Paper text:
In the present study, we elucidated the crystal structure of Mycobacterium tuberculosis H37Rv HigA2 (hereafter referred to as MtHigA2), which contains an HTH motif. The HigA antitoxin represses the transcription of HigBA or forms a stable HigBA complex, thereby preventing the ribonuclease activity of the HigB toxin and the associated cytotoxic events.
The crystal structure of MtHigA2 was determined from three distinct crystal forms. Form I belonged to space group P212121 and was determined to 2.0 Å resolution, form II packed in space group P43212 and was determined to 3.2 Å resolution, and form III was solved in space group P3121 to 3.4 Å resolution. However, the N-terminal ∼25 residues are unstructured in all three observed crystal forms. All dimers share the β-lid as their major dimeric interface, but the position of the α-helix bundle varies. When the different dimers are aligned based on a single HTH motif from one monomer, the corresponding motif in the dimer pair shows a different relative position. The flexibility in dimerization leads to drastic changes in the locations of positively charged residues on the HTH motif, including His54, Arg56 and Arg59. To predict the physiological dimer, each form was submitted to the PISA server to calculate the strength of the dimer interface. Interestingly, all of the forms had similarly favourable dissociation energies (ΔG): −14, −15 and −17 kcal mol−1 for forms I, II and III, respectively. This suggests that the flexibility of the β-lid does not impact the formation of a stable dimer and is likely to contribute to function. The three different crystal structures in our study reveal the flexibility in dimerization mode while anchored by the β-lid.
Author numbering:
A (entry chain B): 31 to 100
B (entry chain A): 31 to 101
Write the structure that this text describes.
């Protein structure tokens, strides 16, 4: 059900070089986070990389039965 | 929202310095998060704090008429 974000940036036929250039972040950072690991990666870094695809990013927190965004 | 995790942490009356140990992260990192600024956080670092507290960390992406997960 999880769709790691390399196969999501390929939904709209785009290349890392292109996502890294309107995100204004080193292609180093795209390769690492597009690889399959999103931990290392900052939030702002991630947020910028998703804004590139013309999407929005939401961090929702769930504990017991309460939910809200950061 | 802003005043949340603070309330949540204080909700169970836990001390900043406890959490910093429960999730094995710098206490300073906890003032920041609880503080409100979260952009500068690494994702795993943020995840740890939520884990230690007891909840879960969900990262939904909305792309027009869609919604996907990734961790």
């Amino acid at each position: 059900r999880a769709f790691r974000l390399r196969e999501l940036r390929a939904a709209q036929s785009l290349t890392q070089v292109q996502v890294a250039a309107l995100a204004h972040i080193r292609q180093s950072r795209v390769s690492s986070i597009e690889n399959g690991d999103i931990g290392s990666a900052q939030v702002n870094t991630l947020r910028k990389y998703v804004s590139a695809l013309g999407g929005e990013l939401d961090i929702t927190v769930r504990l017991g039965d309460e939910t809200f965004t950061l």
